[PDB]
Structure 1
Amino acid sequence: NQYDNDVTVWSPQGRIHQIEYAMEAVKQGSATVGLKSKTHAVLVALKRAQSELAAHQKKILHVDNHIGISIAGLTADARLLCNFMRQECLDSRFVFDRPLPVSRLVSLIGSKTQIPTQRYGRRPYGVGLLIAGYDDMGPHIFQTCPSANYFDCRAMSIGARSQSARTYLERHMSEFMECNLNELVKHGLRALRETLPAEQDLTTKNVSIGIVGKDLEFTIYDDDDVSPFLEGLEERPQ
């Protein structure tokens, strides 16, 4: 095909297949889970292992005490956007000394990721992100795509095998809004279990959680926090 040069090439079909390949690179990532209540925002991650003598790749990165992120893609661009959001949060704390609202930051990332999509010389940032953030205007759970677009989701899941999760969150969204933090994290864990293969099960080693709240700063909930929340998980019947 002639039409697979840089994103500058418009397809006759009205597409730019580089962008679609970027979405596929998003689907190249592992399963992720993101869900909020009316008072908290929680994202749940599945840390992919490498071997019995190596550690799992981390999926949840800290940007600010009020905004958290979860990645799915080529980790290079993921970390580059992570540093970007860290810098913008710092400038927001510097100028007027105010925690940056989620929406404006996400719009800035959208513009930044869009500039490559028009301009030759740089591939668009090809990583899928889940964003958890709370501000003085509202609680937010967000996702973004390398197409330089972002979507505010009550409940969201990206990666391989994610459709079973997506069905779980679509069925249960009649429940979360006023669920407590423990119930919300249990819902997230149940959503993760849906994507699991029949031969693999959740444990502290491969599960990562991230929670932010109006009265709870964003922190990354790894093995230590995974240990108590594992109880109450839905079983695996047939």
Structure 2
Amino acid sequence: TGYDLSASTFSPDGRVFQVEYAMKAVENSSTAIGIRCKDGVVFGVEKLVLSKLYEEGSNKRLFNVDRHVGMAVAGLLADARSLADIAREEASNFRSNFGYNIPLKHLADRVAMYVHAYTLYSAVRPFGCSFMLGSYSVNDGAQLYMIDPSGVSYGYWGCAIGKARQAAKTEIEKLQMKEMTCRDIVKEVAKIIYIVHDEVKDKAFELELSWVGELTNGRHEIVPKDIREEAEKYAKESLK
């Protein structure tokens, strides 16, 4: 006993335990799904309402790192906001130093290195967040990346982070994203959200959607209200 009290000790089998506990803490989020279309990326998050007192749109889990970059979060909230701030600062510094918008393959590496810097020393603790970055550019295409508390960043075609990650990716697999444009894919994201999180777990929930791609002309922003409403209208037919 005593091999898991510090982040600077190796267990006899040869693995750090604190990062595993951080991953376990991350494993209690709700859900966040990201799918890249032919000409952009689409995010979708299902949010749990604790009580009627909280105002609509509180605890936003969908940030804006840059003019063309999105972000999706799972885990603790404080660390997520800190990571968002550091990513914003790094992107601003890169833009000011060189003179053009930072690509994703560099921003993801910088943030992953900053996250990994905390899992070496015994004077700090590992982060408790897992997040997803997405963007679109005219000369680069659509880009999606996933980063976890350990500090491993990968590219993806479609990913899910949170409690029911497997039950969501098993339904992403049936989807064919390589061809169809992401004007109707919001419908698929809504439908895949409503087919998870049985009502026994919690009483009710709300939906949040993002948008970035050629349709939005580079910029990342929230989906329009009418399109989202039509998305729920189409996704509500799962009862059949």
Same fold (TM over 0.5): yes
Alignment partner of 2:237: what SS? coil
CA contact (8 A) 2:116 2:150 kept: yes
1:96: Cα distance to partner?
2.5
**RMSD (CA atoms):** 2.3
Q: CA–CA distance in 2 between the matches of 1:50 and 1:201?
A: 9
Q: Does 1:183 align with 2:184?
A: yes
Q: Which residue of 1 aligns with 2:89?
A: 87
Q: Which residue of 1 aligns with 2:173?
A: 170
Q: CA–CA distance in 1 between the matches of 2:207 and 2:50?
A: 14
Q: CA–CA distance in 1 between the matches of 2:47 and 2:120?
A: 34
Q: Which residue of 1 aligns with 2:21?
A: 21
Tell me which amino acid in the other structure corresponds to 2:161.
I
1:32: Cα distance to partner?
0.8
TM-superposition CA deviations, 1:126-184 (whole Å, max 9, x none) = 10112112234231122110001112111001111232111011222xx1122222222
Under a length normalisation based on structure 1, what TM-score does the superposition of the two structures give?
A: 0.90
Gaps of 5+ in 2: none
Q: Which residue of 1 aligns with 2:60?
A: 58
Alignment partner of 1:118: what SS? coil
- Closer/same/farther in 2, CA of residues 134 and 236 from structure 1, 3 Å limit: same
In structure 2, which of residues 142, 145, 148 is the aligned counterpart of residue 145 of structure 1?
148
1:119: Cα distance to partner?
1.6
CA contact (8 A) 1:102 1:134 kept: no
CA contact (8 A) 1:33 1:191 kept: no
Aligned residues: 235
Q: CA–CA distance in 1 between the matches of 2:61 and 2:29?
A: 10
Alignment partner of 1:62: what SS? strand
Quote the sequence identity (%): 26
CA contact (8 A) 2:70 2:220 kept: yes
